[PDB]
Every structure is written in structure tokens, then in C-alpha cells.
Amino acid sequence: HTPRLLTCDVLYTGAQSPGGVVVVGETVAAAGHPDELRRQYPHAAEERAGAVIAPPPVNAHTHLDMSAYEFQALPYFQWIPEVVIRGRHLRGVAAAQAGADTLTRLGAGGVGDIVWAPEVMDALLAREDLSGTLYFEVLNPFPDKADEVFAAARTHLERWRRLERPGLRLGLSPHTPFTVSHRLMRLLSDYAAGEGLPLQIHVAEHPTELEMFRTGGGPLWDNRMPALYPHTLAEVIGREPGPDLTPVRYLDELGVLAARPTLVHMVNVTPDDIARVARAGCAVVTCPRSNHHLECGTFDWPAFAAAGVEVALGTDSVASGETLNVREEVTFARQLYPGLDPRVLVRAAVKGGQRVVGTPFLRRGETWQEGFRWELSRDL
Ligand SMILES: [Zn+2]
Numbered sequence: 001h002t003p004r005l006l007t008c009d010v011l012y013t014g015a016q017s018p019g020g021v022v023v024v025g026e027t028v029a030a031a032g033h034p035d036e037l038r039r040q041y042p043h044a045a046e047e048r049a050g051a052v053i054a055p056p057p058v059n060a061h062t063h064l065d066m067s068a069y070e071f072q073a074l075p076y077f078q079w080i081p082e083v084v085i086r087g088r089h090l091r092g093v094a095a096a097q098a099g100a101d102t103l104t105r106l107g108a109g110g111v112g113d114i115v116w117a118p119e120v121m122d123a124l125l126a127r128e129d130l131s132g133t134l135y136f137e138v139l140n141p142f143p144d145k146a147d148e149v150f151a152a153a154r155t156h157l158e159r160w161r162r163l164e165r166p167g168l169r170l171g172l173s174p175h176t177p178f179t180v181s182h183r184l185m186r187l188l189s190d191y192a193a194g195e196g197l198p199l200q201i202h203v204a205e206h207p208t209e210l211e212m213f214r215t216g217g218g219p220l221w222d223n224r225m226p227a228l229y230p231h232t233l234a235e236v237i238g239r240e241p242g243p244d245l246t247p248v249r250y251l252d253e254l255g256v257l258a259a260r261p262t263l264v265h266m267v268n269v270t271p272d273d274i275a276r277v278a279r280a281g282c283a284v285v286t287c288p289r290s291n292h293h294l295e296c297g298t299f300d301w302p303a304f305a306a307a308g309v310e311v312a313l314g315t316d317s318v319a320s321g322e323t324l325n326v327r328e329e330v331t332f333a334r335q336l337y338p339g340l341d342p343r344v345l346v347r348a349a350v351k352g353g354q355r356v357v358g359t360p361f362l363r364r365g366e367t368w369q370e371g372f373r374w375e376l377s378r379d380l
Pocket residue numbers: 061062063114202264316317
């Protein structure tokens with residue numbers, strides 16, 4: 001027949017750069033380094049196929065439905081009006097179903113979705129086109145309410161666990177280290193660890209979070225809505241904030257990292273925090289655009305990579321992440337980390353995410369799919 005050599009900047013079948021794929025008809029003949037290919041197929045016509053050739057990326061963290069409650073609980077979300085405004089429509093089943101539709105049109109790559117409304121979980125759990133993990137979000141900073149909140153959450157979880165099918169599993173998501181009491185956090189992590197339920201916790205997203213764990217105050221805590229929290233952060237976390245404390249150290253000493261939960265954002269951490277995460281074997285999900293729009297600072301990917309921590313990519317909800325298309329986060333991340341090997345970004349988008357949410361192979365014999373050529377991606 002007639003082989004075609006499609007070349008790209010980064011290929012992921014470990015990622016390779018430069019990259020290339022020889023296609024014969026609609027079948028992959030070979031995939032690897034391009035020079036190897038031009039030498040193996042001298043008569044093959046070449047085609048510049050764009051920057052990336054790889055399976056559709058996994059959106060390891062997003063919210064297809066949210067609550068005014070979680071917006072109200074986080075002061076820094078309010079400081080960026082556009083985010084609150086954009087987030088208002090992200091309520092209920094209809095909006096969630098439309099989001100899932102978008103994910104499917106984008107390549108049907110896996111997804112790590114945080115769910116708020118029980119009715120949304122009912123609907124998404126029944127989506128035969130989705131794959132990944134649906135994490136039920138739990139939020140309550142009052143120690144005295146921990147037992148009852150846990151019991152209510154467990155009931156829902158036990159019910160849904162029976163509806164769970166291969167490819168789309170149920171997960172749990174304690175909101176943050178400061179909107180969930182220390183008692184409820186441990187009840188949740190222990191339960192999930194024992195039942196084999198994946199976990200995702202938003203940690204150290206904004207710098208003001210690290211500040212209050214150190215001083216008990218600052219722009220976040222001092223500007224919260226009083227009725228939504230106990231009178232002191234100490235009451236929420238069960239210990240006094242201090243100079244040597246951080247939300248990560250808090251979770252580590254609380255014994256929550258023992259369950260190997262996936263930590264989201266993780267922008268404002270210290271070298272010691274990174275060491276604790278690496279030791280525990282926790283994976284982390286970074287949402288580039290979201291962090292930028294929420295003025296949270298920048299995730300230190302090179303530091304996490306050097307520590308050997310598994311990194312995945314997410315877009316976060318569209319309120320702060322713009323779109324549900326992770327291909328766009330890869331582009332953004334390339335700009336954020338000039339010294340970081342682009343191959344690391346692509347591998348993270350695909351393999352990293354798959355490992356977090358639970359990947360098509362691109363090799364000889366496999367059907368060549370246009371979905372592997374990112375430059376041709378359509379969200380409609
Ligand atoms: Zn989130």
C-alpha cells in the first residue's frame with residue numbers, strides 16, 4: 001500500500017519528542033522517533049501533524065455541578081467576580097448532563113468529577129459514555145456534626161456503590177482541610193481506605209490557606225462568613241495553628257495521607273510538604289488555568305517532578321478553568337514551565353490522569369484514529 005509519515009512535536013503511545021506515526025490505510029504501521037521512521041519507510045510521504053499525537057487526555061479534576069455553598073465557603077473565589085458569575089449556571093442535573101456531553105465530544109477521555117448534588121450523581125452514574133471516577137463532595141467544618149454527616153454520606157455511598165459499573169467508579173471528596181473537621185476528615189479517609197474508594201482533597205490552593213494554618217488568621221479566615229464555620233480554625237482542625245504548620249503537614253500527621261488520597265491544586269506548599277507527599281505515595285492534580293484566574297500562584301511542577309510525585313492535569317470547573325478541554329491546559333502548562341520537558345506534560349495529561357481516575361494504545365496493528373491527532377480536536 002502507501003505508508004504516510006505523520007510527524008509531531010510530542011508523541012505519546014513514556015512520551016517521545018520529536019515524534020512520528022507511520023500509517024498504512026487506517027492502520028498504524030509503527031510509532032516512535034521520526035528519523036527511525038524516515039529510514040524504515042523512505043517512500044512514505046510526510047505530513048506535519050501538529051504539536052501532539054496521543055490518546056485523548058484525561059480531565060483528572062473538574063466539577064460538572066457545584067453549589068453556592070462551596071463558593072460562599074471560599075473567600076478568594078469571591079475576590080474574582082467573573083468566577084462567581086460564571087459559576088452560577090453550574091447547578092443541577094441539566095447543566096451536569098451538558099458538561100458530560102461536552103467531555104464526550106472532546107474525545108471521551110477519562111474524567112475525575114467532583115459531585116455535589118445527589119441527583120447529579122444519580123444521573124452521571126448512569127452515563128454509559130463516561131469513564132473515570134465520580135467523587136461525592138463532603139463539606140462540614142463543625143467537629144460536633146462529624147458523626148452524623150459521615151453517616152449520611154456513607155448511606156448515599158453504600159447505595160451508589162451497588163450501581164457502580166466497570167469504567168465508572170464511585171469516589172469520595174472531603175472538600176478542603178479547613179471546610180471539613182479533623183474528625184470528619186479521618187472518618188472519611190478511613191472509610192474510603194477500607195472500602196477501596198478513591199479520594200480527592202483540594203489542598204493549599206490559595207496562599208491565604210497556608211497563612212491561616214500558620215497564624216490562625218489572614219485574608220481567608222478573617223474574611224469568611226462566620227455562620228459557616230466554628231469560631232476558630234483550631235476548632236476545625238483539632239490543633240492550634242503555628243509557624244511550623246501547613247495544611248499538608250496537618251493531613252499527614254492526622255493520618256489522612258496514609259489512605260493515599262489524590263491532592264488537588266497543591267500550589268502553596270513547602271519543600272517539606274512535597275517530601276511528605278512523596279513519602280505517602282499520593283498523586284496530585286494541577287489545574288493551570290484555574291490557578292491563574294483565581295490568582296492562587298503557580299503549582300511548582302518541576303519541584304514535584306523532581307520529588308517523583310505523580311502529576312495529573314485537570315481544568316477544574318469552567319467557572320475558573322475556561323473549558324473542560326485538558327489539551328488547553330497542556331498548552332498553558334508549556335508556557336508556565338519553560339524548563340520542563342514537554343514530554344512530561346503530555347504523559348501527565350494522558351497516563352497521569354488515567355492513574356488517578358482509573359488508555360487507548362497507539363502501536364502497530366491499532367486502528368489509526370483522528371482522535372489521536374490533537375490539532376484536529378473539536379468540542380462540537
Ligand atoms: Zn475542585
